[PDB]
Amino acid sequence: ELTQDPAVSVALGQTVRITCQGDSLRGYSASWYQLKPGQAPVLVIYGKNNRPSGIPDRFSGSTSGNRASLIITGTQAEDEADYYCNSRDTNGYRPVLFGGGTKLTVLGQPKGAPSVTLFPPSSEELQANKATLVCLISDFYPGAVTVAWKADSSPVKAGVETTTPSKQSNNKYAASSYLSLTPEQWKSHRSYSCQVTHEGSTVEKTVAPT
Amino acid sequence: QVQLQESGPGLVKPSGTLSLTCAISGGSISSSNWWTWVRQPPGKGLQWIGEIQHGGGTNYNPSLKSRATIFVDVSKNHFSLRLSSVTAADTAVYYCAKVPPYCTSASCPDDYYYHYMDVWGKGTTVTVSGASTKGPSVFPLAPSSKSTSGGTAALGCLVKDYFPEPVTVSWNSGALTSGVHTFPAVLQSSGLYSLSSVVTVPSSSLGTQTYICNVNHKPSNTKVDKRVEPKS
């Protein structure tokens, strides 16, 4: 019943307009919610350009008949998110309806290089007959990295698990890579290395049993 | 000032019944508000579940009406959701929310002709699975100044091999918040999750300030307070 543009892009600093359509908008108007991963939705606009406190004034919007618009001026990196249209049907039991969502991409965000921190297994974990190396990657943009591990200088073919990148509070990305070893594997090599490649550059951190 | 907080078991077996409660604080449940449940399946959009008005009726998403019931406990200032015969399609983050009153007739105050969802809970993660709950093992990530700015060091906690999501991590019982970076969890081939929380602190404090990470894994009723000390 509620239809919105599923994908819109805007250049950083420019104005974007997200639209929603549906007969249910004629009665109680549209409301808009910003949705970021790992986070609860946030009401940004409803009614006749009603803006909750805490929402910056670059957000605005209104409803006209069966159509509604959410307008963001001077769009910023933190505005990149999913936006959901919302309404209440006027017929029947008056169900609350949600649009399918609009994925807003903010183009031209500045590149940032990754910072890499590598922790060796703790002595307490080794005593529990396990060994986990933890490679933490922060502050990079765009959110595409490749992570490779080495035992001494040989590539590791088992035990690696890396997260998908996720946004930080500063709108850069973070990711983490784990290498699960036995204590025997950890102690039998001179060192292990975590190699992070981002935009053609590589950062390698190395730890050794001691 | 009205605030909402979801509670409930984070793991439900298939064909079981999901039971969630939302606590209302900073305000009373005894109003014309529509106390609401919403969910977000992973990788999918928001879905309205239903609503209840104290002294009024209920109202449900027809696609879920055969399995969802919403109640009110006026004595506890809570309202609740029960979802029966769950399957994988019900794995989601569940939110409670507040919807102000609306009018169906004329001559109401003008505010009541607008629908919106004002206040939201933080959300609770529900995983439908036959797998058993597993509590985490917590290990220290001993301090290191290699990747930090001058005069500071990074130390942390590894929260290893738990199921299901989520875990929360604080530092020094919440007194330490500056410089804390808790990373989203990885899902291992074992089907168990692991995450790390790191805090960057002044190097001058390492030998004198106690650092403890407070790990909470509610699905397994496990709490761990792990002391993190410099290596020797």
Number of spatially distinct domains of chain A: 2
What's the CATH class label of the largest domain in chain A? Mainly Beta
Gyration radius of chain A, to the nearest Å?
24 Å
The CATH homologous superfamily of the largest domain in chain A corresponds to: Immunoglobulins
Q: Sheet with the most strands of chain A?
A: 6 strands, mixed
The largest contact between protein chains, plus residue counts on each side, is: A-B, 55 and 51 residues
Q: Which outline of chain B best applies?
A: elongated
Question: Could you spell the SSE succession of chain A in H and E letters?
Answer: EEEHEEEEEEEEHEEEEEEHEE
Shape of chain A: elongated
**In CATH terms, what is the fold-level topology of the largest domain in chain A?**
Immunoglobulin-like
Overall SS class of chain B: mainly beta
- Give, in order, the helices and strands of chain B: EEEEEEEEEEEEEEEEEEE
CATH architecture assignment name of the largest domain in chain A: Sandwich
| Ends distance of chain A | 64 Å
Which range does the strand content of chain B fall in?
Answer: over 45%
Give the % helix of chain B.
under 10%
Helix content range of the residues of chain A, please?
under 10%
PDB class: immune system
Keywords: antibody, immune system
Assembly: dimeric
Entry title: Human antibody H1244 of the human antibody lineage 652
